[PDB]
UniProtKB/Swiss-Prot annotation:
FAD binds at residues 12-16, 38-39, 46, 51, 107, 159, 312, 328-329, 357. Its EC number is 1.6.99.-. This is Apoptosis-inducing factor 1, mitochondrial. GO terms for molecular function: DNA binding; FAD binding; NAD(P)H oxidase H2O2-forming activity; NADH dehydrogenase activity; oxidoreductase activity, acting on NAD(P)H; poly-ADP-D-ribose binding; protein dimerization activity. Monomer (oxidized form). Homodimer (reduced form). Upon reduction with NADH, undergoes dimerization and forms tight, long-lived FADH2-NAD charge transfer complexes (CTC) resistant to oxidation. Also dimerizes with isoform 3 preventing its release from mitochondria. Interacts with XIAP/BIRC4. Interacts (via N-terminus) with EIF3G (via C-terminus). Interacts with PRELID1. Interacts with CHCHD4; the interaction increases in presence of NADH. The gene is AIFM1. The chain holds residues 127 to 613 of 613 of the full protein. Residues 8-357 are annotated as: FAD-dependent oxidoreductase.
Length: 454
C-alpha cells in the first residue's frame, strides 16, 4: 500500500495536512504528497460537528455528513471528494503526481537522523520533507479518570465524526445530558443539544467553574450575556461549578460539586480542552514547549532541517505577538498552507494572522483574532444589533467589539455579531498603534455611540 519513499510526507489527515498538501501542489505542480492518517476517514472539517450538522432537518444527516450553512447552501464535511485523491500505490507512477491518503495507519516512530518513519504495521517510509500535523486529543476530567469504567463509558469526549454520531444517538435515547466545560465547544454543543431537546422535551445541563460562558476569553458583561442566551436555548446553565466527584447512583450519573451541590443526569460530555499530540517527539528527539505544550517550532514553523509542524500541535514564534500555540480551524489552514510554502523553499515567517469564529446557531456569532484572554486588560464598545448582524444574514445591546491590550496597544480583538470586518481587525493588530480613543476605533466596525461608563 505505502510506497517506500515519498518526497512530501504529511503526518495526520486533518485540516493542516490538507491545506499543506494543497499549498505544496500549487507551488510544485508535479509534487508527490502522501498523508498518513490514523483515522479511517479522508480529511474533513470539524466545525460543523458542533454546529450546522445538528441544525439539519434531514434525518439522514448522520449518514450523508452534508449540511447547510446558515444561508442554506449545502456542502460536505470532507475537504474534497474521494476522486480528488490518487491511491498511495499509484503515487510514484502517476504522471504529474498527486495527493494520496493512507487511511487507518499511524506513524509510531520518527527517525529524524535517517529521514525515515515507521507505521504501526511495521512499514517504513523515507521522505525528503515532512510535516507533523497531528492535532490534539481531548482532555478528560481527573474526577472522571478516578471514577469507574461505568462512568467513563457514559462520558463523551467530542472531536470526531464518530463522536457526533454517538452523541446524536444518545440525544435521542436519554432524558438528561450534562456538558462539563464553558468554552466555545461546550457552549456550541449546549445550544445544539438544547435545540434537539425542545422537540423531545428532554434536558440539557451545562456546568463550568467560571462565572459565565467563555469566561476565560470574554469579559464579564459579554460572558454573562452569553450565559443568558444559552439559557434561552433551553439549557440549564450552572456557573461557579467545580466537579469534586462523579459516581453512578441507581442507574443515574451523580455529579458532586465542590460547593456541595449534586446534579443527577444520564450522560456527560466533557469539553475541557485539548492535549496536543506529541508522542512522536520522543523517538524524533524533538523539543516540546513546556509553557504552551506542543512541538516547539520557529517563526517559519520549522522544527529541524526537513521537518515542519502546523495546526493545533505547533507551538510557534510569532514575531509580532510572541510565542504562542493556537487551536483554531483557520489557524490550521493558514499554518498548513505556510508550512507547505516553506517545504517548497518559501522561507516565510508566520505573519498573516489567523482568525477564530463561533456560532451559537444562526442568530449569534463571534469572530476573534490575535491574543484574546479575559485576564488581559480590555475595552468593550457595544451597540444595538441591526437586521444584518447575525451569522445567517452576513452570508438592549446586540453587537460590539472588544479590544484586548498589552503595553497600551491592541493585541487581540473579539467581534460580537459583526461580520465581514476581519481584514480591518487584522490591520489594527498589524499596525500596533497607541490609540487615543478606542470608541473612535470602534467606528471602523460600524459601532457609533456616545461614550459609556466601564
Ligand atoms: C467539534 C469541533 C468544533 C470546532 N469548531 C471550531 C470553530 O467553529 N472555529 C474554529 O476556529 N475552530 C474550531 N475547531 C478547532 C479546529 O477544528 C481545529 O483547530 C483543527 O481541526 C486543527 O487541525 P489539525 O490539522 O491541527 O488537527 P486535526 O484536525 O485534529 O487532525 C489531526 C489528525 O491527525 C491524526 N493523527 C494524530 N497522530 C497521528 C499519527 N501519529 N499518525 C497518523 N495520524 C495521526 C489525528 O487522529 C487526526 O485525524 C473545532 C474543533 C472541533 C473538534
Amino acid at each position: 500500500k505505502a510506497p517506500s519513499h515519498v518526497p512530501f510526507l504529511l503526518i495526520g489527515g486533518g485540516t493542516a495536512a490538507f491545506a499543506a498538501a494543497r499549498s505544496i501542489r500549487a507551488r510544485d505542480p508535479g509534487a508527490r504528497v502522501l498523508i498518513v492518517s490514523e483515522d479511517p476517514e479522508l480529511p474533513y472539517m470539524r466545525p460543523p460537528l458542533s454546529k450546522e450538522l445538528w441544525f439539519s432537518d434531514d434525518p439522514n444527516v448522520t449518514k450523508t455528513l452534508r449540511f447547510k450553512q446558515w444561508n442554506g447552501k449545502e456542502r460536505s464535511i470532507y475537504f474534497q471528494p474521494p476522486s480528488f485523491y490518487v491511491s498511495a500505490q499509484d503515487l510514484p507512477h502517476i504522471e504529474n503526481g498527486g495527493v494520496a491518503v493512507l487511511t487507518g495507519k499511524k506513524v509510531v516512530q520518527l527517525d529524524v537522523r535517517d529521514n525515515m518513519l515507521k507505521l504501526n504495521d511495521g512499514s517504513q517510509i523515507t521522505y525528503e520533507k515532512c510535516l507533523i500535523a497531528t492535532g490534539g486529543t481531548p482532555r478528560s476530567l481527573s474526577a472522571i479518570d478516578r471514577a469507574g469504567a461505568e462512568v467513563k463509558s457514559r462520558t463523551t469526549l467530542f472531536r470526531k465524526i464518530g463522536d457526533f454520531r454517538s452523541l446524536e444517538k444518545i440525544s435521542r435515547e436519554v432524558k438528561s445530558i450534562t456538558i462539563i466545560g464553558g468554552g466555545f465547544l461546550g457552549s456550541e454543543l449546549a445550544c445544539a443539544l438544547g435545540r434537539k431537546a425542545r422537540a423531545l422535551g428532554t434536558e440539557v445541563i451545562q456546568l463550568f467553574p467560571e462565572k459565565g460562558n467563555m469566561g476565560k476569553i470574554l469579559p464579564e458583561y459579554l460572558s454573562n450575556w452569553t450565559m443568558e442566551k444559552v439559557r434561552r436555548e433551553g439549557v440549564k446553565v450552572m456557573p461557579n461549578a467545580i466537579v469534586q466527584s462523579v459516581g453512578v447512583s441507581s442507574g443515574k450519573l451523580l455529579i458532586k460539586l465542590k460547593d456541595g451541590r449534586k446534579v443527577e443526569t444520564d450522560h456527560i460530555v466533557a469539553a475541557v480542552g485539548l492535549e496536543p499530540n506529541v508522542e512522536l517527539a520522543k523517538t524524533g528527539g524533538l523539543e516540546i514547549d513546556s509553557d504552551f505544550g506542543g512541538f516547539r517550532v520557529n517563526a517559519e514553523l520549522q522544527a529541524r532541517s526537513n521537518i515542519w509542524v502546523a495546526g493545533d500541535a505547533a507551538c510557534f514564534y510569532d514575531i509580532k505577538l510572541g510565542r504562542r500555540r493556537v487551536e483554531h480551524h483557520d489557524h490550521a489552514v493558514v499554518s498548513g498552507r505556510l508550512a507547505g510554502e516553506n517545504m517548497t523553499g518559501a522561507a516565510k515567517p508566520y505573519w498573516h494572522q489567523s482568525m477564530f469564529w463561533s456560532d451559537l446557531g444562526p442568530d449569534v456569532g463571534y469572530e476573534a483574532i490575535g491574543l484574546v484572554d479575559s485576564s488581559l486588560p480590555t475595552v468593550g464598545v457595544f451597540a444595538k444589533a441591526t437586521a444584518q448582524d447575525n451569522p445567517k444574514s452576513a452570508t438592549d445591546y446586540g453587537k460590539g467589539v472588544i479590544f484586548y491590550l498589552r503595553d497600551k496597544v491592541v493585541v487581540g480583538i473579539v467581534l460580537w455579531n459583526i461580520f465581514n470586518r476581519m481584514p480591518i481587525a487584522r490591520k489594527i493588530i498589524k499596525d500596533g498603534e497607541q490609540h487615543e480613543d478606542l470608541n473612535e476605533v470602534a467606528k471602523l466596525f460600524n459601532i457609533h455611540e456616545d461614550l459609556v461608563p466601564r
